[PDB]
Design a protein around this ligand. Structure first.
Ligand code: K
Ligand code: K
Ligand code: K
Ligand code: MG
Ligand code: MG
Length: 126
DNA sequence: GGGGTGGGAGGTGGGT
């Protein structure tokens, strides 16, 4: 016996954007958390799923949700070079200063992973 | 194992 939250997480993990849209509409819990502390927003942000990122936020996903390592969606987008995703997160109130367990901000992670264009976007906001 | 340009049939295979 599963629930809408767990299904949402699975759909997010598998990149099934259509499935996500359905679950959202049937009222799935936007802030469900997997065993690592990832919300569906974490997974879409890491995966590069821009449209779903917008869907989740529309449905009120927590923009600054932190995982078990203190990583926010912003940290995950930054590690993967998803610039557009970064702008959308930022436009929705992402905190540029959140530090993960290692002290790193999104800025540092973006530098670490060679993502200079989104680095610049963040640099403006430090 | 590890990543999301591999896909969703798994989450008691594990991380994002
Ligand atoms: K997998
Ligand atoms: K595999
Ligand atoms: K796999
Ligand atoms: Mg992007
Ligand atoms: Mg970049």
């Amino acid at each position: 016996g599963s629930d809408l939250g767990k299904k949402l997480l699975e759909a997010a993990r598998a990149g099934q954007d259509d499935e996500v849209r359905i679950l959202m509409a049937n009222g799935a819990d936007v802030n469900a958390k997997d065993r690592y502390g990832n919300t569906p927003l974490h997974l879409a942000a890491y995966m590069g799923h821009l449209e779903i990122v917008e869907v989740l936020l529309k449905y009120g996903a927590d923009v600054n949700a932190m995982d078990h390592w203190g990583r926010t969606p912003l940290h995950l987008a930054a590690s993967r070079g998803h610039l557009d995703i970064v702008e959308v997160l930022l436009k929705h109130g992402a905190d540029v200063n959140a530090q993960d367990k290692f002290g790193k901000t999104a800025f540092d992670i973006s530098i670490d992973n060679g993502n200079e264009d989104l680095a610049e976007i963040l640099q403006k906001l430090n």
